[PDB]
Amino acid sequence: VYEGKAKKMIPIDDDKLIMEFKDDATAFDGTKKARFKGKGWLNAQLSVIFFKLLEEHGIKTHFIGVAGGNRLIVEKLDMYPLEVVVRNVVAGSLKKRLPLPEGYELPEPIVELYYKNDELHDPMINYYHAKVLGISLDEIKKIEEIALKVNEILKDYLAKKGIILVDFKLEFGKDKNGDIVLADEISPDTCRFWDAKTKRSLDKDVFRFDKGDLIEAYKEIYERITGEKPEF
Amino acid sequence: VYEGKAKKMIPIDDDKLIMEFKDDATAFDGTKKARFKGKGWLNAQLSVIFFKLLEEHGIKTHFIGVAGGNRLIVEKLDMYPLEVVVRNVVAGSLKKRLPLPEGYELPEPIVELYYKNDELHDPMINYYHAKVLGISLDEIKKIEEIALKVNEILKDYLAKKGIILVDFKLEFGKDKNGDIVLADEISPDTCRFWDAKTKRSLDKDVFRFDKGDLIEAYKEIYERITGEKPEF
Numbered sequence: 001v002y003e004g005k006a007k008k009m010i011p012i013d014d015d016k017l018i019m020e021f022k023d024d025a026t027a028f029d030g031t032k033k034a035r036f037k038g039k040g041w042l043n044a045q046l047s048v049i050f051f052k053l054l055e056e057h058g059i060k061t062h063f064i065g066v067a068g069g070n071r072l073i074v075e076k077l078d079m080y081p082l083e084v085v086v087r088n089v090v091a092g093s094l095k096k097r098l099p100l101p102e103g104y105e106l107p108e109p110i111v112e113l114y115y116k117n118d119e120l121h122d123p124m125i126n127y128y129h130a131k132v133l134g135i136s137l138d139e140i141k142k143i144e145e146i147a148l149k150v151n152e153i154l155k156d157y158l159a160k161k162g163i164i165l166v167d168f169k170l171e172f173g174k175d176k177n178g179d180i181v182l183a184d185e186i187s188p189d190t191c192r193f194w195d196a197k198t199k200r201s202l203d204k205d206v207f208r209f210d211k212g213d214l215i216e217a218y219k220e221i222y223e224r225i226t227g228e229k230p231e232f
Numbered sequence: 233v234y235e236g237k238a239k240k241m242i243p244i245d246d247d248k249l250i251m252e253f254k255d256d257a258t259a260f261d262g263t264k265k266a267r268f269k270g271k272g273w274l275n276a277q278l279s280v281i282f283f284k285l286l287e288e289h290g291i292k293t294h295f296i297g298v299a300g301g302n303r304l305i306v307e308k309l310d311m312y313p314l315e316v317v318v319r320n321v322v323a324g325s326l327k328k329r330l331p332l333p334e335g336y337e338l339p340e341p342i343v344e345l346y347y348k349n350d351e352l353h354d355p356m357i358n359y360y361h362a363k364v365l366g367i368s369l370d371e372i373k374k375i376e377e378i379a380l381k382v383n384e385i386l387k388d389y390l391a392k393k394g395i396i397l398v399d400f401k402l403e404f405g406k407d408k409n410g411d412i413v414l415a416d417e418i419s420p421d422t423c424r425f426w427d428a429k430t431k432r433s434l435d436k437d438v439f440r441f442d443k444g445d446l447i448e449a450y451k452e453i454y455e456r457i458t459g460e461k462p463e464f
């Protein structure tokens with residue numbers, strides 16, 4: 001059993017594991033910490049909806065099934081040590097890299113690669129760093145191609161629900177066939193979602209910058225997407 | 233007349249300018265400052281030697297000629313807002329991006345792109361940031377191809393002189409034909425040079441980290457390269 005900041009990973013056999021979503025939330029390299037009753041449930045359910053949508057569009061994900069509420073069954077993968085960030089609208093750390101205001105609409109998507117490494121606080125890397133880390137150029141290109149395809153599908157789907165997909169973080173791993181498979185989660189923890197009309201955050205930024213009620217914000221996302229009220 | 237931290241750029245006509253190398257040295261985003269009599273002369277002379285070597289190998293540079301001691305005549309270019317860093321051996325900021333020790337020999341060269349921007353303290357960017365900045369993918373690829381070719385020529389030439397080319401920073405601009413031209417300088421200010429036998433720094437790191445006599449170090453480079461003693 002691996003216990004992370006947001007989730008628990010419980011081995012089943014050699015082929016699969018249980019991904020359990022906790023109520024814990026962290027920010028700022030994990031220096032800001034809180035708990036939000038029902039957060040795990042919402043993130044689990046939204047991950048499921050997103051993975052299923054993406055699977056219908058021919059994206060290979062680790063999603064296998066549900067294991068009752070806060071737990072997903074997922075394929076075990078040899079993980080790439082990357083966080084792959086896709087950005088449509090300027091926000092967060094991008095403001096420190098390009099002299100563009102928050103809300104600036106990008107002419108095309110930006111993909112950023114981050115090296116998952118706590119010693120180094122997850123630095124941004126490029127393709128040459130990735131190669132030194134054992135990730136070939138073809139693997140990187142395949143990964144960015146998938147991320148960009150995921151972007152189009154999620155942003156289209158969300159725009160039709162009055163939600164702007166500002167940016168989001170993905171993780172990937174390799175399966176036993178050597179195929180690149182989308183992993184981890186897709187939730188208001190790992191994406192920026194803005195209301196189309198008011199431009200307000202319906203995501204982890206509410207917690208990051210004390211913008212109000214996180215659970216309310218995560219509920220509103222769930223309701224706008226499912227059309228139903230959360231049961232917890 | 234543009235006065236920078238290390239050099240002066242003096243317009244001649246519309247086609248060319250004077251690049252004058254000053255004795256000033258800065259480090260740590262320009263927060264550490266000193267002057268070293270003769271530094272401008274050494275950097276000017278070594279730039280000339282490097283530009284001429286590179287021109288012989290068919291690298292297009294801005295070098296036109298000499299204008300007496302500390303001044304080079306150079307082609308005026310529409311500069312890319314980039315610093316292009318090529319790395320052969322782990323040193324400097326690379327230690328904070330990859331968990332590798334100083335002196336680690338890289339399996340192949342790393343190219344890093346930095347956005348020249350004082351507001352943002354020159355952040356690292358990738359190809360997607362560059363595109364948003366108006367630099368096309370083909371331009372970036374051409375730039376990295378040149379940097380990597382420059383790397384091979386300088387490292388070979390220096391190894392035959394008992395000097396390890398650890399890493400170095402280049403800058404580029406476009407000429408009136410739309411060609412990508414190597415610009416700025418190539419000196420112990422803009423490269424890491426290590427003695428092959430002892431691994432000691434013969435470059436700006438001497439000043440950066442108070443490792444001894446900078447002018448001596450820059451002189452030793454000049455002598456190992458030219459085979460003559462500096463005249464100043």
Ligand SMILES: Nc1ncnc2c1ncn2[C@@H]1O[C@H](COP(=O)(O)OP(=O)(O)O)[C@@H](O)[C@H]1O
Pocket residue numbers: 003004005006007008009062074075076077078079171173183184185
């Ligand atoms: N299909 C998968 N196979 C193996 N590991 C995975 C898979 N999906 C996600 N992971 C990893 O499981 C962990 C999930 O826990 P989490 O709390 O989100 O991360 P962290 O512990 O880094 O904060 C992460 O290390 C993530 O990279």
Ligand SMILES: Nc1ncnc2c1ncn2[C@@H]1O[C@H](COP(=O)(O)OP(=O)(O)O)[C@@H](O)[C@H]1O
Pocket residue numbers: 235236237238239240241294306307308309310311403405415416417
């Ligand atoms: N051929 C060229 N044409 C136009 N500008 C150049 C050329 N070569 C170098 N430059 C620019 O001239 C300036 C040289 O001064 P320097 O002191 O080294 O830079 P800075 O002022 O940024 O510290 C830099 O801004 C550099 O980008």
Ligand SMILES: [Mg+2]
Pocket residue numbers: 004006
């Ligand atoms: Mg995580």
Ligand SMILES: [Mg+2]
Pocket residue numbers: 236238
């Ligand atoms: Mg400069």
